[PDB]
Design an enzyme around this catalytic site. Structure first.
Site, PDB file in Angstrom:
ATOM      1  N   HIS A 147       0.786  -1.268   0.000  1.00 42.68           N
ATOM      2  CA  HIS A 147       0.000   0.000   0.000  1.00 42.68           C
ATOM      3  C   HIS A 147       0.808   1.303   0.000  1.00 42.68           C
ATOM      4  O   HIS A 147       0.271   2.398   0.198  1.00 42.68           O
ATOM      5  CB  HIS A 147      -1.020   0.030   1.155  1.00 42.68           C
ATOM      6  CG  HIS A 147      -1.810  -1.250   1.268  1.00 42.68           C
ATOM      7  ND1 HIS A 147      -2.731  -1.647   0.310  1.00 42.68           N
ATOM      8  CD2 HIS A 147      -1.788  -2.234   2.209  1.00 42.68           C
ATOM      9  CE1 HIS A 147      -3.266  -2.794   0.687  1.00 42.68           C
ATOM     10  NE2 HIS A 147      -2.711  -3.161   1.837  1.00 42.68           N
TER      11      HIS A 147
ATOM     12  N   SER B 223      -3.056  -8.027  -1.170  1.00 38.60           N
ATOM     13  CA  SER B 223      -4.169  -7.371  -0.468  1.00 38.60           C
ATOM     14  C   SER B 223      -4.871  -6.293  -1.320  1.00 38.60           C
ATOM     15  O   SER B 223      -4.238  -5.320  -1.767  1.00 38.60           O
ATOM     16  CB  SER B 223      -3.663  -6.750   0.790  1.00 38.60           C
ATOM     17  OG  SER B 223      -4.789  -6.278   1.508  1.00 38.60           O
TER      18      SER B 223
ATOM     19  N   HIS C 158      -6.347  -0.430  -5.700  1.00 37.34           N
ATOM     20  CA  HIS C 158      -5.105  -1.054  -6.130  1.00 37.34           C
ATOM     21  C   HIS C 158      -4.980  -2.406  -5.425  1.00 37.34           C
ATOM     22  O   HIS C 158      -5.819  -2.794  -4.613  1.00 37.34           O
ATOM     23  CB  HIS C 158      -3.904  -0.101  -5.809  1.00 37.34           C
ATOM     24  CG  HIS C 158      -3.652   0.018  -4.347  1.00 37.34           C
ATOM     25  ND1 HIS C 158      -4.005   1.131  -3.622  1.00 37.34           N
ATOM     26  CD2 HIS C 158      -3.309  -0.918  -3.438  1.00 37.34           C
ATOM     27  CE1 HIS C 158      -3.756   0.917  -2.344  1.00 37.34           C
ATOM     28  NE2 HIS C 158      -3.286  -0.313  -2.212  1.00 37.34           N
TER      29      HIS C 158
END
Length: 220
Positions: free
Chosen positions: A39, A105, A124
């Site tokens: 992330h 994830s 994303h």
């Protein structure tokens, strides 16, 4: 040479809890989904070339094409890893990704109450450095077909639809450059205990077996 590919189920229906009705509303995404590491913004190494609504859950196929990534991983993991094995850079990258970023994830936005999902819901897909929490299992390989092949339970319909959308993604041929230093900060987590790695690798092995994905080269 160049790109490698990554695939997996983002979630499984009935087994982060995305229902069918949510996934139907979120696909196809507003814009192609980037692939980043954990992330981290400004840390894009690739893109999702397609996402399909398989009967078991939303399933994605991604490209990774970051020329500095293999050397930062190799350096992180350290000089003894490959022994005597004679391997290309691409192969070395595949072993490293499969053992140090073995899960993903999906980033979806938290919705305010009464805000319906739409095609901006998914932002994303992070590839997750191995650590105290593992995400959804992914498979890496040198071609799109090889990256999806271990998932035997993926419907024929979703598999062809996936490989055909992917074959037309504008992102197919991109390259993502990243600084040695940015990648190093993002990948520092690969330098935590033996405790944490042996335990995580067993978890990853069990989760791969539960997902039906097996192999001898990159997988076990």
């Amino acid at each position: 040479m160049g790109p490698v590919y990554v695939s997996g189920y983002l979630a499984l229906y009935d087994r982060l809890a995305l229902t069918r009705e949510i996934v139907a509303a979120a696909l196809p995404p507003a814009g192609p989904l980037p692939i980043n590491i954990d992330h981290r913004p400004r840390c894009d190494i690739g893109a999702v070339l397609a996402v399909v609504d398989d009967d078991r859950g939303p399933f994605f196929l991604g490209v990774v094409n970051c020329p500095q990534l293999g050397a930062v991983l190799a350096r992180a993991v350290g000089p003894d890893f490959f022994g005597d094995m004679r391997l290309s850079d691409e192969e070395r990258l595949l072993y490293l990704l499969s053992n140090y970023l073995p899960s993903a994830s999906l980033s979806s936005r938290r919705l305010a109450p009464g805000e319906a999902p739409d095609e901006t819901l998914f932002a994303h897909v992070a590839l997750c450095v191995i650590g105290r929490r593992v995400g959804t299992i992914v498979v890496y390989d040198a071609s799109p077909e090889a990256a999806v092949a271990p998932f035997r339970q993926l419907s024929a319909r979703a598999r062809s639809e996936l490989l055909a959308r992917a074959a037309e993604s504008p992102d197919r041929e991109r390259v993502w450059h990243m600084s040695e230093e940015a990648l190093t900060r993002a990948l520092l987590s690969t330098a935590v205990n033996n405790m944490l790695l042996r335990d995580r690798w067993e978890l990853v092995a069990a989760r791969r077996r539960e997902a039906g994905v097996r192999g001898h080269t990159y997988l076990q």
